[PDB]
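Hi,

I'm pasting everything inline rather than attaching a file, because the server keeps stripping attachments. The sequence lines come first, and each chain or strand is labelled.
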Amino acid sequence: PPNTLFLRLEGALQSWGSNEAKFALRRTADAPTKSGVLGLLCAAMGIGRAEAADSWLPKLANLRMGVRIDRPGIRWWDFHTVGAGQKTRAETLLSRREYLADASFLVALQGEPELVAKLSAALAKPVWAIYLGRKSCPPSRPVCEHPPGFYNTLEEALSAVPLQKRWHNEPLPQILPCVMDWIPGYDGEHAPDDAEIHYDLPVSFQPPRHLPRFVIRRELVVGEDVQVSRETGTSVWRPKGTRADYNNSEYKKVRAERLVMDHAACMVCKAPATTVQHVNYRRAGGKEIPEDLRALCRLCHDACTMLEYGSGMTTNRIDPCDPIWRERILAKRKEIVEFRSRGR
Amino acid sequence: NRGTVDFIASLENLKEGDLGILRKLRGARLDEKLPGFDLFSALWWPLRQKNQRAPKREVAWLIAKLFAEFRFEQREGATLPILMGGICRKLEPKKELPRVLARFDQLASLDIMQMEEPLSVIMGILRKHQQVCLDWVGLTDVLSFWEQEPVKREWSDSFIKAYKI
Amino acid sequence: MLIEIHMIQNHSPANLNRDDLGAPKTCYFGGVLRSRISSQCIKRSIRTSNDFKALAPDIALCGRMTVEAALQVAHAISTHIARPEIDYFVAADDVPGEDAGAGHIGESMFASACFYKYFSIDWEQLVKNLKGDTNLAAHTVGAFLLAAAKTNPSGKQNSFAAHNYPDGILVEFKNSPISYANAFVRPVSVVKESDLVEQSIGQLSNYVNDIRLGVIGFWFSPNNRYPLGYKHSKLASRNIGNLNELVGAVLDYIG
Amino acid sequence: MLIEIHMIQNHSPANLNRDDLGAPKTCYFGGVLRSRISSQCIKRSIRTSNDFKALLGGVRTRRLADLIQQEAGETECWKKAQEILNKCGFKNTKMLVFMSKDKIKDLARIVLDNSLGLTEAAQQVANVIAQATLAPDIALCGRMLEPNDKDKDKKVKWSNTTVEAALQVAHAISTHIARPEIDYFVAADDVPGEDAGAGHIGESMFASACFYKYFSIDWEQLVKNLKGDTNLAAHTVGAFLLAAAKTNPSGKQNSFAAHNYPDGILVEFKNSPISYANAFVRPVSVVKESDLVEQSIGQLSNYVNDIRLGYYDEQSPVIGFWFSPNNRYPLGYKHSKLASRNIGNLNELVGAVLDYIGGFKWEEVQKS
Amino acid sequence: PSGKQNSFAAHNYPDGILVEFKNSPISYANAFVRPVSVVKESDLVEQSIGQLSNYVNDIRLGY
DNA sequence: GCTAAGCGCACCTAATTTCCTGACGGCAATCCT
RNA sequence: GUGAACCGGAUUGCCGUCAGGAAAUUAGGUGCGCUUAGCAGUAUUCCCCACGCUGUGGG
Ligand SMILES: [Mg+2]
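And the predicted assembly:
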């Protein structure tokens, strides 16, 4: 029943090279060529160099497809120096290679249902490593992300799949290009004046022989036929939360529980205790368990807070339960008695 | 934002002797003097308990010391890169203006525990030009939000648009 | 089945890859400019190295004259906005003359970046071009881990001795080849309480916290310096503190 | 066999390195600004250090004809030296040429001052310049030279001038966030006037930071560069250690006399270079207890423990010596007992690393 | 230095002068990397000379 | 066994000048004869 | 395996070198924390254990 298969092509870089490149200058096309997506599917099935040649191209090539450009990635040129010989000699081969940076494509191939089912099954199970046209460009989103469906035409299939926002506040293209294989309509019907030639129909793949094809572009407008999706995640990391409060009900029960086994007694000077102090803030706010809390008196909790404020104590506060942190606590508590007015 | 406006109001309601003990505490921490820590506790602990959006300890201490030192009234729409930046139009553009601009430029590269001295010289430049009002609330919520780049970005181009008028 | 290796490596200020004009190589991602190390740079750095040199191994890992090598690397996209810098040098004449200065009196370019580096191996084809030598393939995968853990691009390093080590390696054995570059569509903004590598690893952790919601993962940080996921949540299958036991666990999972 | 030197050095307010505009060199590391000292400045200060006069043996000059003419009391030969150098490949008073000093003196005097042919004399001069690579500073810093093929005659051939560098120096980055500071200076007029104004007004730029310095020496490449004379290699290593510990870059030292000595040196012996700058990815913030050198040494010890408990080889143990003056700053203050040989003397440290290198004592190797 | 000495007559003579003769220039500023905290029973000058002596002894023994 | 009201100031002035460096140094191969 | 697979931009380097921010300056004028009080001449002293219920083992 589903006659359309969908491919999601997104990565950090991608390069679907055009016809005018097998010299040292090796440029790219603005959209994925038919040979590129056909090769991606051939790797997903996982047949050999000549096994594609032996009656596999026209079964995937008569599938009149479309490619939908979500966002336009910019053309980045990489300065590639091949070492040539590093039989060998000190000569360096010079090259510049074009890549599409930050672009997302959706490719909808329309064909008979069983081929689409086999293509989706092989897309979920790539027997070989698949990439974005060049081996150094692995995909950043799953190629089998969007499920297949049944659609009468290429336009309905390419307008059904939504456009996914990577983050919450990013500029989206109001106008969205779509490039499809030219539907001949009725028998005859010579190609219109806007039909451009494109040498990307594979008939042999070692060495690559490409056949011309007619390629036509429509425009889609988002918000009426292409709809956005939800964010479905978080972008920033934002490490965990400090600043436990002092008025929530879950605080007072733990605070009163810690005042029991300590018998309302301080821990450094053994005075009658009236408050509690925290040792670490790994758990805070309301989530507190009574093994990292120290029952402290009024005159020494203030000294502890006087000492931990700017010592860079981060999370693990002053423990009154080790000898290392204690000997200066008494020296501190010497002078809170000395200068505070007792008189809220 | 709640917790900050009442902090500014309680700082403005402080009397002269309390501001004096805050003035003497300027330049150091609050672990070496008792009444500074008692005052910070009195002005922080109940407002920390009452509101979840209380400012962070060290930025609140910095703003308390700076308000004790300089004592400018709270007024909306009078943040630092507007007032300084309108001050930066009346100076000699080739020598003096780059020097005051570098004085304001230094502020973007400190952490929170040495920040009070370049702020002090900037507010001294403000005091030398008879500036009575400062967005204390605005200064403290952009200072407590110092961990991000967009906040320093809007700080900076606010200075730019104050300069280009 | 595919072995995927996502490595986070913070490099000290240097120039590991140079373009035609001497700048650090630069890519475009997340709607901002990133520092880039080219794939072939990392490939040749891993190859031809006595750290790795210690049917034919390393012909299957990186091909040579229809090999279709099992291991390929992605371009090292930085987790943050690239910060290229001018370094001004002079070369003294070191002979007393009436003037001063003799050298190029030029300017070099350098940048420091935290790189996400993606590596993918297919196991089945790596066995296939090794003629069924499963033990040799396991040994050469362990050798890949050992080398790529401690080999840097041997670019301009005499004047910029950048020999930093990765602070985080995630190894999974998932179904489809996915790169986590989409984790860093956000450039990493640095906060006062956390460092750059911790924030980058946290962004990776918050991104692998998704995808599973809508496979396994071995996490390596030196002596658990950076834990993947600052919680007790089931996000990393095994938090591993040493590289040797990471390689051992991966090898005993494979065989 | 790689010798690795990791030093922690706290400096007084100073301007050791400056860019075009007279500002201290700054680089972004970990997303924050860090004060930077260029590796070329450190290499020059090491080569022009007082612990290098008995070891300095290389000149990198474009005024080679001046050097060749200087060994001639009455034999005036400067235009012919310039002509033979111009035909050698240099195009002018030349490009920068690096080779030994006694070599250029003696060999160029006996070659180019000789009344003989012209093209093959240039070939002899080129052979002398290229083959003169027996100097330990040339062996450490490295050199390759390429002459202009246009001005050179077609009958002059050049041999391999590529000297592989056995020394890798990193740029000294601060362990904390960079603190650029401005010094407003005037210059008073020594004669009085009716106006009382300065002769000049300017702004110098200075910064005080705790720098992390990184050096790496390849012993096999060093003994390949200096050939089989391993005594000179040990002398070079000891002179390098003494110069790196006891010499500062000669920046604005007359106005900023910052000659502080490093509080911590780790000399590690391993076959793979390790940069501990990732210890200071998180900037060092000061606290009430301890100081900046103590905090930086603690962070460095934490990272050293993490690396040893992380990247570790049973086949090649990691081993290093820790330096502190009279054991003032220990490395593993809490738990990291990794430094086996905390050493409180520079000569003892040099002797220990020379003994690990082999059967060498410092007094024995101070004769080559 | 004669900077505002008419309003701040600070003509205090040095409390300690260490004159050393050596071939290489060394400096003792690193003694005061940790700031001097005044205790009640001692002095700022006394503690400054004590820290300077600690660093001088350390440098003399290790360098 | 432990109290409670009421009361908390504003006006004046906030400055002037002048000086702000120069010269020197800027590389070459090698990527079809 | 897809204008694709195999594929470094390589190395040679002190910005350096000269410098007082300098001379001038009262923070002054005004001020009550203050009005009430036995640590004790008793009438339930908060109690767990125990005496024909007023001794007895103590929190
Ligand atoms: Mg106590």
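Chains A and E do not touch (no CB pair under 8 Å).

If the labels don't parse on your end, tell me and I'll reformat.
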